[PDB]
Structures are given as C-alpha cells and as structure tokens.
Amino acid sequence: ASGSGEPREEAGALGPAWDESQLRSYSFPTRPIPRLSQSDPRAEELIENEEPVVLTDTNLVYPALKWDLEYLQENIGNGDFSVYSASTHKFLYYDEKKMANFQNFKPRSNREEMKFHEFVEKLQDIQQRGGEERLYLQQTLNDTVGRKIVMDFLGFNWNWINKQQGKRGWGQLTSNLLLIGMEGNVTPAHYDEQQNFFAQIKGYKRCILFPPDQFECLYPYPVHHPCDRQSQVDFDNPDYERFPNFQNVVGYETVVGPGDVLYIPMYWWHHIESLLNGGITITVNFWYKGAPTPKRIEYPLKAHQKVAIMRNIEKMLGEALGNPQEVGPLLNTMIKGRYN
Numbered sequence: 001a002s003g004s005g006e007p008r009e010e011a012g013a014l015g016p017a018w019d020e021s022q023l024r025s026y027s028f029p030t031r032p033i034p035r036l037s038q039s040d041p042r043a044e045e046l047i048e049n050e051e052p053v054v055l056t057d058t059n060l061v062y063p064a065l066k067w068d069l070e071y072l073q074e075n076i077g078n079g080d081f082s083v084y085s086a087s088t089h090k091f092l093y094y095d096e097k098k099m100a101n102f103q104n105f106k107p108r109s110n111r112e113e114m115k116f117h118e119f120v121e122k123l124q125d126i127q128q129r130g131g132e133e134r135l136y137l138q139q140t141l142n143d144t145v146g147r148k149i150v151m152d153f154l155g156f157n158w159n160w161i162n163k164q165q166g167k168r169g170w171g172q173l174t175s176n177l178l179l180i181g182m183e184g185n186v187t188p189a190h191y192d193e194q195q196n197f198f199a200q201i202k203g204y205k206r207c208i209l210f211p212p213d214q215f216e217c218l219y220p221y222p223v224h225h226p227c228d229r230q231s232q233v234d235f236d237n238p239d240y241e242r243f244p245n246f247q248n249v250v251g252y253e254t255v256v257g258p259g260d261v262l263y264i265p266m267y268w269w270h271h272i273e274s275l276l277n278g279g280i281t282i283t284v285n286f287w288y289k290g291a292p293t294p295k296r297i298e299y300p301l302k303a304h305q306k307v308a309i310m311r312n313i314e315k316m317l318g319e320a321l322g323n324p325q326e327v328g329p330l331l332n333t334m335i336k337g338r339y340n
C-alpha cells in the first residue's frame, strides 16, 4: 500500500520531492525503513544489528551534491566507463565469467566501455530521438579521475564512515561504484556479500529491501548461473506456479534523495528503481568486506549464515562433479523421496 510513507516536503516550500505515481506497482506489502540522524543511537543500533537504516545527515558525499552531467563531463577525466544498455526497464546483470557454464541462455543487457562524453552524447540522443532504449553507467571510480573530482572525493566524510568501519569490525573498503541512470531504470532484486553504504547524490531512488530469511520467497538463480545472487522472480509478472512463496514476501521500502545514505546490510535483498519521470539519478556506493566469522559458532545460525552454507554446497558440488550442470540432478536425487 505505502511503505515509503508520505513524500517528504523540501525546504523553502519547493513542494513534494516526489509523488506515488512515480513509483512502480507491485504485488507485495512493504513497511518503512527508519529515517534517522547519524547522531541518533537507534541508527547506531540498527547498523550494529545489521538492519537497514537511512541516515539523513552524514554529509558523507556532501561535496558530490553539486555533481551533474556537465560538471562530471569536464572533470571526471577521460577514462573508460562501463555503460549497460537495455531494451526494457529492468537491468539484469550477468557474471561474464560464468557465461561459459550456461550456453542455452542469452544476455539482454550488454556492457560497453566508452568515454564519459560519449555516454552524455549517447544519452541526450535518446531524449531527442525519443527512443525507448535505456542506459546505466556503472563504473568503479579509480585515480584516472580529474583534479576537481579527486578534491571532491577528499571532501567526503571519511571521519564518519571510517569509524563505522572500525566499530563494526568490518574489512577494508573494496570499491566506490559511481552510478548514473535514466529515469525508470530498475535494478531487479538481488543480494550482495558485502556491507554497503548507499549514498544518494542526484535524483530519487526507491529501494525495496528483503531480509535474508526470505531466501525461500525470492528464488535466486543457481550459484553457477551468470545471474547468480539475483531473484528469478519477475516483480512485474511473478510466476506464482514456479515461485509460490513469493506470495509471502514482505519488503522494507524507502525513497532516498540527495544527501541520504541507505545502509544495505550484507546479504539483504534489494530492488532499486529510479523514479519515473524523475530525471537522471546519481549514486556512489561504499562496499566493505564484512566482519570475519566469530571464533566459536553461536546457535541457532543466523539466516545469512545458512545462505552462505547453501552457496558453499553448490560450489562444492560444482567442483566435485566436474560440471556445474550436474549439481541440480544430484541435489534432486538426494532429496526426492528422502527429505521432501
């Protein structure tokens, strides 16, 4: 019905940031992710318990809030940027290394390296031409990046995020992923194995999250499939015959805007959509390797540990059988008439 709640009113009486007609319609109920300040101890407790929370005042990417297409085009440099195209609004991602195991499936969102000015050229053409094609720039930011953007990076609130890394016992910061998308772009539900600080910069993104214990309801692809860690369920046209427990899924929902930081806990499903008719969206992700597994295991196992266990079983069988395609039949032989 309404998970994000009523839209926030922007300062200076500039009206509603968004309205619900910019959100896509789905079949499952949702509830709000808490919007808190970083000074609120409840926000600290949520991150500690690995629950999602939107922090409204970290100033994490404060110097990046002036970023738009033309400022980035003149300052980001002339490196290569990964640009993904799609004939539809859903951008299904593929592990290209795993595309050898599954030949009978074809990709529908091809990557293309290009210069940043070529991406801005390619985008504005689509708007004048009026085409239905969509693009999504998704590029880890390196040091081939120009002077002013390095200075902007230096202006990030490293004090706040470094102590978050320390107090949680997390591993190191693995990468910063810059993301520029078109309105209506959708990133279908999937989970990551790293802790994520999701720093919104330009435009608005509706984030629908599912806790790890709803693994049964979301049906991820086989670990060896190129779409590993993504849900097989089409949120627009869910197949309740193949995926009956998707009728039981309950999400956590929020809309992040400029200055907001969404903590996506490790192994939490998330479905991200750039608001319809909301313009371009800009986001920077912060990935941290999770804290190492504790000394002695505490029982019962947390849900994300069972997910980790299930991933390792699928990997092990893939190596033991010499062919990832035999994992399925072996698993069915194991349970049919014995555990089901």
Ligand SMILES: CC(C)(NC(=O)c1c(O)c2ccccc2n(OCc2cscn2)c1=O)C(=O)O
Pocket: 093, 138, 179, 187, 192, 270, 272, 273, 283, 285
């Ligand atoms: C930012 C985005 C689009 N959300 C995401 O979740 C998301 C991606 O786009 C993505 C795109 C290309 C490659 C990897 C990606 N990963 O995972 C990291 C990974 C891949 S392989 C091992 N680890 C993502 O998580 C949003 O819309 O906000």
Ligand SMILES: [Zn+2]
Pocket: 190, 191, 192, 270
């Ligand atoms: Zn993700």
